[PDB]
């Protein structure tokens, strides 16, 4: 029964994400928004034999109509990286995009869950919060930075190394979504896994620089699109399940947090009807994992402040 | 346990198709092929938390290694339409692509199920058959023209007009995949539906021109990609289920046929372990539907002859 | 003192063509039209330090304002070929595009010179003629099928083989613009050149299939764009010089002709203030060249009929 | 006559640039390089009826053959901006592209004039210089950051305000190529123009934001391509004229400079047979202009160091 808007639906992530949402029995209305090509994408998907009604919207004059009555908004809108770039190279362009779109959300569907994919997530979530505070509708239990792909990657890499089935593996990943701020808690992995430190370190780095590995492999043709569509769909489904009374639903996500001195931080969250039911916190961790958390905090706070300062100039 | 090859994996269809395939526990190995961009696509999908081992292959030199050991090969490789073009206007270009790709298949995975998505399907399937014949490995039970999107469109459109869930609608569509050769048997629809003749004609025209509807809506940005990825994934899943011994798997598909004077024709096929188990035939049809079959045959024969003639000059 | 419109200005040919026109002191006003990207292209071109004022127009609502007061219209709007395509595969698409765009010309700038680049020229010139008839403003001295690239190619190749400066070479090319209908009158070449019949035949084939060789070299990335921009700029410059009263300006172009049983035909044309001042005809030719003319006529008639037929259907 | 290499010849700037170079009687040989599409672009251009011999090169193995014997190398290779990006946001991607390509030039055509178009120019010229130093062939009189488009824009905008022929306007533009580092010296314009202050300020700002204006207008489809092709060609032609012994050839360009405290800086340069004959300096400026120089210096030094540092960490 959920009504989901996808802002940036014509892009690399947007189209396959919209596909996965259209294919879901959980979605009864799918509104697609972009600045280009949205009508053709909507017609394409409207032919698929599922109940979700698909409507496409094009340009800022139609963004309000796209947002009317939505339960979840997902925002893959933004520019992807080229080889060599950092996520902060995209900050200027994507901060404007995220601020503009989340402003419309605050105006026209303030009650909706806001799921931000656009990078750098470590800054774009603070931006979303400060835009919502600006319109006086800020609810910290309903704004999510989608880090799900870090968890998905962690599970895959663990499963390959130990010959396990990825569907059975679960690795909490905490901190943020950029380089050393991505902290995989291999010591909390279910099932339990033992690696020597050199292999643990190699696995940790692989997970951290996984996005960059894909940017290099694509050689100028963009960043992770299909896996991020999978990761975004997964997160939305988790959130909607929880919204229909499903219990025990847990997903890591970068949110407003009091667990560390960072005002925003990613930890496992129990999800409920009002978004975040309970922040489950960092929990018990190794020395190696404590070192990474401690090392990640300055970069996190700098990014958090960079997003806040950007909204301050609006 | 099914090893699936996608030829044309970097395209508008190939990428979301490859995603849907990667997401399924029916696929144990997903080998992707194209003339550009495949390594990045493979890198992207390899991070998804499912069992399928994803490998990428690039250029004619690597095509044999993409195909070896394959159970299924799907071929979305081909040029799509621009507004104003017929599917037949693509023949010359796409003919050479299908012939070359299917020759490698006949040489390197002759036992595999061959699923051609490339247009015009009415001519490209005959090209595939003649190519396989030329190499002495022609099995008419394993060569499939993917017409599934026509069925998906029919189901959806009927479901919309009757207020039904399209997940529990099934309209057999027969003939071929081009204009008037697309024949939806609404008389055989489950559940039973009865339209007056004025509406039935419009519904029938809508289904026939659905592909062109998406072409115009995309205004030169290509044809159906996401819905075709859906339809193609469904057909492969149906085919892989049947190969795993699942019973009652029925799909319409343009295949080597003796149901009419046409050498190739689409009807509901019972699929099994060896490919086509039994052609379920045209069945009991209305006068209206009987006229369309009669009207379609000359065009289908021409399209078939065109395809056969192309291989004759190789 | 000439106001020129480019219809299809955002395309592969359109952009470099518009650039060459912008650079010319013959052009005082340049209006650019497309269905996509025009404002960005016009903004880019308007920064160049030449006198021509540039303005961009997007979509059919802005087409009339583009054409008002136009002295010359050049029409590269259309779909180019992929490898394997015949020029007739693009007929249905381009015929529609040419018909639409020439109707607006007929209504809004009926006295303007109409230079059609869009293929197949052998049919799109007939289409342009009939559309102009419907609106009661047909003038056959102002409608030009741009075949200049063929002449340009012929000059380059003859110069290459003979070690000449291509600026000092002129080869009349007659007939039409497709395959064997492209007839280089090497016997009329200035300066005089002497080839054995074997070299002459291969050279003649090279000229006829030149467009195809470029399509092959681009491997799906399109057809001749930069060389066509050059050729189209040359023809437009020739025409605008003649319109300003320059004498002895001669260009081959595909036009309304009584030189043969074909109703449209390309021969060298004396241009002047009314457009076509005098058709210079075929002249004396070799037996070899007479043979090619004879063989080409059936193709030309067919192509002329096809375009004329298409217009009746609107 | 001049042998000119274009690195990044298949791009938006590279292709039209290559066309302008091909059309010019000052070019005897045109060698084109890119990582994709080069052979198609070269085949296309090789049909144009000018004397310049055109050859296309593709991939690292063929780069040296492209550079051998070159008098001038133009390097448009690089990633363009999207809306909201600064030129500096392209640094991390384009630093490696410029470093590689200029290392190739240092090896294979060290005596050639090196014209860097790739952004950010304020940092990529220092990169170029440091790469030539590493190779022991650094000649500061032959390394040029192409700022010519800023001058072209200034000439055009001044001519539009005053109602002049832009062919007769020359505005020196100094400093660098980004935002407030672009300093148009309207007080040194020929002919002398007197502007009311409100127009002068809006003019100055227009010149500085012109690049961003075009990026905005292209709405994600790149940056200035056609006007940059015009400007880069103009610069090459001035360079070749001066190489052929023409006197009084002056062009502004971002070069090694001892005019301010910035080690690199753009001023009018008298060009001669060996590149820079003489840096003509800042000359006499107004207070308004002196202040713009003062404000620009901190940003220039920062962009310079950024470029130098990049090379020292290799
Ligand atoms: N959170 C993650 O783990 C994660 C992973 C991968 C990528 N990303 C980010 O997702 C974003 C999108 O990546 P992509 O590959 O889809 O890029 P893309 O260029 O393929 O698509 C971007 C889409 O956003 C649209 N867009 C741009 N401005 C818009 C606006 N103002 N309003 C509405 N739509 C607008 C574009 O038109 C395009 O359709 C990037 O910022 C990328 O860095 C995040
Ligand atoms: N059966 C149907 O109902 C149906 C529906 C939609 C589209 N189609 C057809 O599917 C085909 C693909 O459509 P699309 O939208 O993905 O086009 P696309 O242009 O987006 O991608 C097609 C892909 O084919 C690849 N390709 C071309 N030649 C190749 C070769 N020789 N070897 C390997 N790869 C090659 C291209 O690189 C490209 O990645 C088209 O022919 C279209 O007509 C069929
Ligand atoms: N005369 C010749 O010798 C010759 C040579 C080469 C190419 N051509 C023809 O040139 C034409 C285009 O070539 P290209 O390489 O520029 O193709 P392209 O695809 O690069 O550009 C085509 C442009 O036409 C535009 N367009 C399409 N429909 C339009 C419409 N209805 N109104 C306005 N604009 C429209 C598109 O938006 C695009 O910008 C083709 O038809 C090709 O066959 C002719
Ligand atoms: N100096 C100026 O005023 C000015 C003006 C406009 C643009 N620019 C800069 O020029 C570049 C814009 O170029 P464009 O608009 O043609 O972009 P584009 O994307 O259209 O083309 C860039 C070209 O770079 C090529 N390339 C990338 N890496 C390469 C490599 N390693 N070796 C050889 N070629 C490589 C690509 O293949 C492509 O052909 C950007 O750096 C942009 O910032 C400068």
**Which residues in chain C touch residue D48, judged by CB atoms under 8 angstroms apart?**
152, 156, 226-227, 230
Residue B84: C-alpha distances to residues B212, C33, C155 (Å): 9, 20, 36
DSSP string, D191-227: S-----HHHHHHHHHHHHHHHHHHHHHHTTS-S--HH
Largest CA distance in chain C: 57
Query: Which two three-digit tokens encode residue B85?
Result: 């073009």
**Residue A89, H or E segment:** none
DSSP string, A231-290: HHHHHHHHHHHHHTT--S-EEEEEEE--SSSSSEEEEEEEEETTEEEEE----S--HHHH
Which of B42, B50, B165 faces A166 most closely, judged by CB atoms? B50
Three-state DSSP class for residue C305? helix
Q: Which candidate, B302, B2, B294, B282, places its Cα nearest to that of B122?
A: B302
**Contact A255/A145 with Cβ under 8 angstroms?**
yes
Give the Cα separation of B123 and B99 in Å (integer).
Answer: 11
Largest CA distance in chain A: 57
Q: Which candidate, A148, A195, A196, places its Cα nearest to that of A170?
A: A148
Query: Which two three-digit tokens encode residue C89?
Result: 């595969």
Ligand 4 pocket, residues with Cβ under 6 angstroms: D 7-8, 10-14, 34-36, 76-81, 90, 94, 97, 100-101, 117-119, 121, 146, 149, 177, 222-225, 228
Give the Cα separation of A12 and B12 in Å (integer).
Answer: 10
Q: Which candidate, D162, D67, D81, D47, places its Cα nearest to that of D113?
A: D67
Query: Residues with Cβ < 8 Å from A212, sequence gap 6 or more?
Result: none
Q: Specify whether the backbone of D245 is left (phi greater than 0), alpha (psi in -120 to 50) or beta.
A: left
Q: Which candidate, B23, B42, B295, B6, places its Cα nearest to that of B178?
A: B295
Q: Which candidate, B41, B22, B34, places its Cα nearest to that of B77?
A: B34
Give the Cα separation of A212 and A80 in Å (integer).
Answer: 11
Angle at A304 between CA A303 and CA A307, to 5 degrees: 85
Interface probe with A: pick from D93, D120, D215, D222, most Cβ of A within 10 Å: D93
A214, HSE (Cβ side, Cα atoms, 13 Å): 25
B8 lines ligand 2 (CB under 6 A): yes
- Residue D139: exposed, middle, or buried by beta-carbon count in 10 A (0-12, 13-18, 19+)? middle
Phi first, then psi: give them for residue C158, nearest 5 degrees. Answer: -55, -45
Query: Which two three-digit tokens encode residue D197?
Result: 């202050």
Angle at C246 between CA C243 and CA C247, to 5 degrees: 120
DSSP string, A170-239: B--EEE-SSGGGEEE-GGG-BS-----HHHHHHHHHHHHTHHHHHHHHHTTS-S--HHHHHHHHHHHHHH
Query: Residues with Cβ < 8 Å from C54, sequence gap 6 or more?
Result: C22, C30, C31, C32, C42, C45, C46
What does CATH list as the number for A1-146?
3.40.50.720
Burial annotation D284-308 (CB, 10 A radius, 16+ → b, else e): ebeeebeebbeebbebbbebbebbb
Q: Which candidate, C2, C10, C116, C15, places its Cα nearest to that of C57?
A: C10
Method: X-ray
Q: Which candidate, D182, D297, D236, places its Cα nearest to that of D71?
A: D236
Give the Cα separation of A203 and D282 in Å (integer).
Answer: 56
Report the sign of the C-alpha dihedral through residues B123, B129, B131, B134, in that order.
negative
The CA A284 to ligand 4 mean position distance, Å, reads 50
**Contact A129/A140 with Cβ under 8 angstroms?**
yes
State the count of interchain CB pairs (< 8 A) between A and B: 130
**Contact C1/C30 with Cβ under 8 angstroms?**
no
**Residue D82, H or E segment:** none
* Helical segments of chain C, H only: 14-22, 38-45, 63-67, 91-108, 121-134, 148-162, 197-208, 210-218, 226-243, 287-312
Taking the CB of residue C147, how many other CB atoms lie within 10 A of it? Answer: 28
Q: How far is A162 from chain B (nearest CA, A)?
A: 13
Give the Cα separation of D32 and D43 in Å (integer).
Answer: 11
**Contact A132/A140 with Cβ under 8 angstroms?**
no
Give the Cα separation of D7 and D104 in Å (integer).
Answer: 11
**Residue D274, H or E segment:** none
Give the Cα separation of D143 and D161 in Å (integer).
Answer: 34
Query: Which two three-digit tokens encode residue A50?
Result: 């599922």
**Contact B121/B254 with Cβ under 8 angstroms?**
yes
C12 lines ligand 3 (CB under 6 A): yes
Which ligand lies nearest the alpha carbon of A35?
Answer: 1
Give the Cα separation of D44 and D62 in Å (integer).
Answer: 19
Query: Residues with Cβ < 8 Å from A61, sequence gap 6 or more?
Result: none
The CA B231 to ligand 2 mean position distance, Å, reads 15
The CA D78 to ligand 4 mean position distance, Å, reads 3
Q: How far is Cα of residue C312 from the mean position of the Cα atoms in its chain?
A: 24
Q: Specify whether the backbone of B194 is left (phi greater than 0), alpha (psi in -120 to 50) or beta.
A: beta
Taking the CB of residue D199, how many other CB atoms lie within 10 A of it? Answer: 11
Among B10, B13, B121, B233, residue to substitute to test ligand 2 (most atoms within 8 Å of Cβ): B13
Interface probe with B: pick from C14, C58, C84, most Cβ of B within 10 Å: C84
SS3 of chain B: the string is: CEEEEEECCCCCCHHHHHHHHHCCCCEEEEEEEECCCHHHHHHHHHCCCCCCEEEEEECHHHHHHHHCCCCEEEECCCCCCCCCCCHHHHHHHHHHHHHHHHHHHHHHCCCCEEEECCCCHHHHHHHHHHHHHHCCCCCCCCEEECCHHHHHHHHHHHHHHHCCCHHHCECCEEECCCHHHEEECHHHCECCCCCCHHHHHHHHHHHHCHHHHHHHHCCCCCCCCHHHHHHHHHHHHHHHHHHCCCCCCEEEEEEECCCCCCCEEEEEEEEECCEEEEECCCCCCCHHHHHHHHHHHHHHHHHHHHHHHHHHCC
Q: Which candidate, D43, D28, D14, places its Cα nearest to that of D101?
A: D14
Interface probe with D: pick from A35, A79, A101, most Cβ of D within 10 Å: A79
Query: Which two three-digit tokens encode residue D169?
Result: 């306007």
Place of tokens 């096809």: C306
Q: Is D108 a catalytic residue?
A: no
Three-state DSSP class for residue D150? helix
**Which residues in chain D touch residue A120, judged by CB atoms under 8 angstroms apart?**
none
Q: Specify whether the backbone of B278 is left (phi greater than 0), alpha (psi in -120 to 50) or beta.
A: beta
Query: Which two three-digit tokens encode residue D199?
Result: 């127009």
Q: Note if the bond before A170 is cis, omega within 30 degrees.
A: no
Torsion of CA A129, A135, A140, A146, to 10 degrees: -40
Q: Determine which one of A37, A47, A135, A177 is catalytic.
A: A177
Query: Residues with Cβ < 8 Å from C301, sequence gap 6 or more?
Result: C261, C262
Report the sign of the C-alpha dihedral through residues D197, D199, D203, D206, in that order.
positive
Query: Residues with Cβ < 8 Å from A247, sequence gap 6 or more?
Result: none
At what angle are helices A226-243 and A148-161 packed, to 10 degrees?
110
Q: Write the DSSP symbol of residue D190.
A: B
Which ligand lies nearest the alpha carbon of D62?
Answer: 4
Residue C230: C-alpha distances to residues A251, C148, D240 (Å): 60, 9, 23
Angle at D48 between CA D44 and CA D51, to 5 degrees: 125
**Contact D125/D116 with Cβ under 8 angstroms?**
yes
Contact: C96, B79; criterion CB under 8 Å: no
DSSP string, A109-148: -TTSEEEE-SSPHHHHHHHHHHHHHHTT---GGGEEE--H
Give the Cα separation of A244 and B260 in Å (integer).
Answer: 52
Place of tokens 């001042």: C277
Give the Cα separation of A291 and A299 in Å (integer).
Answer: 14
Which ligand lies nearest the alpha carbon of B176?
Answer: 2
Closest atom of ligand 2 to CA, residue B224: 6
Report the sign of the C-alpha dihedral through residues A105, A106, A112, A115, in that order.
positive
Give the Cα separation of B12 and B34 in Å (integer).
Answer: 12
Taking the CB of residue A284, how many other CB atoms lie within 10 A of it? Answer: 8
B239 lines ligand 2 (CB under 6 A): no
Which of B96, B219, B220 faces C84 most closely, judged by CB atoms? B96
Residue C134: C-alpha distances to residues B98, C104, C110, C130, C142 (Å): 44, 12, 12, 6, 16
Contact: C48, D214; criterion CB under 8 Å: no
- Resolution of the determined structure in angstroms stands at 2.4
Closest atom of ligand 1 to CA, residue A222: 15
Is A87 flagged in the annotation as binding? yes
Q: Which candidate, A44, A48, A38, places its Cα nearest to that of A10?
A: A38
**Which residues in chain B touch residue A226, judged by CB atoms under 8 angstroms apart?**
15-16, 18-19, 22, 41, 44-45, 48
Terminal Cα distance for chain B, rounded: 36
Contact: C83, B95; criterion CB under 8 Å: no
**Residue D108, H or E segment:** helix D91-108
Interface probe with A: pick from D92, D127, D222, most Cβ of A within 10 Å: D92
Instruction: Give the D window 176-235 contacts with C, CB below 8 Å.
Output: 210, 213-214, 217-219, 221-222, 224-227, 229-230
Is B232 flagged in the annotation as binding? no
Q: Specify whether the backbone of A275 is left (phi greater than 0), alpha (psi in -120 to 50) or beta.
A: left
Fold agreement between C1-146 and C147-313: no
Query: Which two three-digit tokens encode residue C176?
Result: 């039409």
Query: Which two three-digit tokens encode residue D95?
Result: 């630093």
Ligand 1 pocket, residues with Cβ under 6 angstroms: A 7-8, 10-14, 34-36, 76-81, 90, 94, 97, 101, 117-119, 121, 146, 149, 177, 222-225, 228
Give the Cα separation of A252 and A171 in Å (integer).
Answer: 10
Give the Cα separation of C217 and B278 in Å (integer).
Answer: 47
Which of D92, D96, D220 faces A89 most closely, judged by CB atoms? D92
CATH architecture entry for D147-313: Alpha-Beta Complex (3.90)
Place of tokens 């005082």: C28
**Closest chain B residue to the Cα of A230, Cα to Cα:** B48
**Which residues in chain C touch residue D226, judged by CB atoms under 8 angstroms apart?**
15-16, 18-19, 22, 41, 44-45, 48
Contact: B230, A23; criterion CB under 8 Å: yes
**Contact B235/B115 with Cβ under 8 angstroms?**
yes
Q: Which candidate, D157, D118, D144, places its Cα nearest to that of D235?
A: D144
DSSP string, D162-180: HT--GGG-B--EEE-SSGG
Contact: B226, A50; criterion CB under 8 Å: no
* Residue/partner pairs of D135-138 with CB below 8 Å, 24 or more apart: D135/D103, D135/D106, D135/D107, D135/D110, D137/D106, D137/D110
Instruction: Give the A window 137-166 contacts with B, CB below 8 Å.
Output: 149, 152-153, 155-156, 159, 165-166
D82 vs A: CB within 8 A: yes
Where along chain B do its domains lie?
Answer: 1-146, 147-313
Q: Write the DSSP symbol of residue A37.
A: S
Taking the CB of residue C88, how many other CB atoms lie within 10 A of it? Answer: 17
Place of tokens 């239990």: A141
Residue D312: C-alpha distances to residues B66, B256, D99 (Å): 43, 67, 12
Q: Which candidate, C238, C210, C200, C276, places its Cα nearest to that of C24?
A: C238
Residue count of chain A, please give it. Answer: 314
Give the Cα separation of D21 and D25 in Å (integer).
Answer: 9
């Amino acid at each position: 029964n959920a009504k989901v808007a996808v802002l940036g639906a014509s892009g690399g992530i947007g189209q396959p994400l919209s596909l996965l949402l259209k294919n879901s029995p959980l979605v009864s209305r799918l509104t697609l928004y972009d600045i280009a090509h949205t009508p053709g994408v909507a017609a394409d998907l409207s032919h698929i034999e599922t109940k979700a009604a698909v409507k496409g919207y094009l340009g800022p004059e139609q963004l309000p109509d796209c947002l009317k009555g939505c339960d979840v908004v997902v925002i893959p809108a933004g520019v992807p990286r080229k080889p060599g770039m950092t996520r902060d190279d995209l900050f200027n362009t994507n901060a404007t995009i995220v601020a503009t779109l989340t402003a419309a959300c605050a105006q026209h569907c303030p009650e909706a869950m806001i799921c931000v994919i656009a990078n750098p997530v470590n800054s774009t979530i603070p931006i979303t919060a400060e835009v919502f505070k600006k319109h006086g509708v800020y609810n910290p239990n309903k704004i999510f930075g989608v880090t799900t792909l870090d968890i998905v990657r962690a599970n895959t890499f663990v499963a390959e190394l130990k010959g396990l089935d990825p569907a059975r593996v679960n690795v909490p990943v905490i901190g943020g979504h950029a380089g050393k701020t991505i902290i995989p808690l291999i010591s909390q992995c279910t099932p339990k896994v033992d690696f020597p430190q050199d292999q643990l370190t190699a696995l940790t780095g692989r997970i951290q620089e996984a996005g960059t590995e894909v940017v290099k492999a694509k050689a100028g043709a963009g960043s992770a699109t299909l896996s991020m569509a999978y990761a975004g769909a997964r997160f939305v489904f988790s959130l909607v399940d929880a919204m229909n009374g499903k219990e025990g639903v847990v997903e890591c996500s970068f949110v407003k947090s009091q667990e560390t001195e960072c005002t925003y931080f990613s930890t496992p969250l129990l999800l409920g009807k009002k978004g975040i039911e309970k922040n489950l916190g960092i929990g018990k961790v190794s020395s190696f994992e404590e070192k990474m958390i401690s090392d990640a905090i300055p970069e996190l706070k700098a990014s958090i402040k960079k997003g806040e300062d950007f909204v301050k100039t609006l």
